[PDB]
């Protein structure tokens with residue numbers, strides 16, 4: 001069987017993810033690598049009208065106190081559902097084609113983001129921003145699709161000052177530094193969470209250690225430096241102080257989904273060509289999988305280009 | 314490994330009786346069977362405040378012209394997420410325990426509803442009520458968990474008049490008696506039954522799609538007909554591929570479900586017996602580990618205790 005390499009480029013917006021990916025794809029032949037780009041078209045037009053604008057306007061209004069917390073949360077929760085749809089369907093149609101984990105791959109699929117961006121990271125950030133309930137965040141977590149073998153996720157590293165500068169220059173977005181801090185924190189916690197789980201961390205065993213980044217490397221993080229720390233929220237706690245079981249099960253799901261992922265960190269604090277070559281080097285250590293049928297490759301190939309043609313800018 | 318029988322009791326709400334559910338809870342008194350009840354405490358308190366009230370009030374306000382269709386859709390969409398969370402969490406934790414198809418089962422697990430109630434049927438009914446976009450409905454559809462072996466789903470049959478009678482006597486907290494919603498949810502579940510048969514008999518929605526504009530049910534009598542929604546179509550009339558893929562997922566999820574129809578036009582004891590009758594044709598599975606059975610039990614009873622009424 002031929003092998004496939006899937007690489008999901010993810011992390012906070014405004015670091016240079018899309019550029020780096022396009023540059024990497026531009027190195028290959030036409031059909032040994034395919035890019036599944038940002039579904040900006042779905043977001044601005046097909047799925048709803050100007051979703052990014054709707055999201056940033058609602059946070060602004062909440063910040064200004066023009067709307068209540070409840071009203072912001074219903075908007076954010078609905079918008080996140082829309083934002084996430086293309087990632088989820090892509091995963092669902094790809095799934096039957098992916099075999100076990102496994103020499104150059106027959107095909108490299110590079111994605112602008114993984115489903116967890118829309119079903120975990122952005123929701124968790126909105127929660128920190130006060131515009132989503134933690135119950136809703138865990139409902140998204142509960143819906144995260146089963147983690148396919150060979151899920152390589154590349155997260156970005158960039159100094160806050162450089163990141164702020166980069167964002168300050170370069171849809172419907174507004175310059176929200178609070179959101180920038182929140183999303184950077186969430187992806188930092190994410191990286192630590194994967195390393196925590198892969199080092200044998202059991203959130204149920206360490207829950208009590210809560211009260212008052214890099215993966216593929218380093219020692220086991222403290223649970224307080226992982227995503228689990230976000231869910232020590234009064235809404236989720238029974239009178240006796242413990243998590244309601246329904247929310248505990250959602251954390252069990254979070255652990256299950258993240259623990260089998262392969263996380264890499266890319267330093268974006270360099271030129272676009274620099275990011276490209278750094279990403280290229282990084283792929284050398286990424287996990288390939290077999291495909292389940294011989295015709296999976298061109299099939300998978302057509303799905304990606306179809307996606308790119310229809311929902312890309 | 315020991316065998317398991319899962320039975321999801323689903324269909325439009327309001328078809329049953331309090332003596333019906335009591336018999337169900339009575340059934341679960343045994344060691345060999347556990348009843349996983351409706352997570353009403355999650356809906357009213359844990360997940361949000363009075364979600365059901367929120368849902369019916371919003372539709373009411375839309376019906377009266379007090380809010381826009383857009384305003385109702387964001388509230389409706391958000392609320393459906395809360396409604397479905399307990400089913401989705403339960404499926405995700407249970408799924409690794411389910412083995413291949415497999416005589417009495419070591420354990421019978423009876424659920425109040427399947428995830429498709431919250432991720433497909435009620436969203437689709439709200440779409441028909443003009444309070445959810447079809448894009449949102451297909452977003453929920455995209456997230457329906459993979460259908461495992463032995464997914465037995467029981468749908469109810471009851472004439473509409475009789476349904477209205479029963480529904481009127483069992484309104485839930487915050488519920489409003491809405492005959493339009495009753496019709497919508499009944500239509501959706503009827504389409505669902507037809508959709509499973511259509512798929513099981515070889516129906517290909519892509520092949521038959523043209524028939525919506527020009528032996529198994531006709532595609533116009535399945536759920537696929539709902540997604541001819543103009544919001545989902547390009548200027549030339551083609552479905553966008555992203556939505557077509559969601560329909561491919563729908564087809565995959567639904568085709569391998571085993572549907573059983575329970576006639577509710579009878580007594581609670583009769584309904585209970587009929588349900589027991591229906592079990593002889595249901596598909597059992599093995600579990601994946603030796604400790605899967607007691608773990609499943611624990612899950613099911615804990616759910617019941619924490620979230621059941």
Ligand SMILES: COc1nc(=O)n(C)c(C=C(CO)CO)c1C
Pocket residue numbers: 012013014052055080083084113117118122
């Ligand atoms: C805060 O709003 C968002 N919600 C999301 O779900 N995503 C994926 C993103 C990410 C991007 C596109 O909106 C930029 O990569 C943003 C910004």
Ligand SMILES: COc1nc(=O)n(C)c(C=C(CO)CO)c1C
Pocket residue numbers: 325326327351365368393396397426430431435485
């Ligand atoms: C119309 O609102 C609903 N949305 C849902 O997701 N469910 C499961 C239900 C079903 C019931 C809760 O009242 C259970 O019968 C309703 C009514």
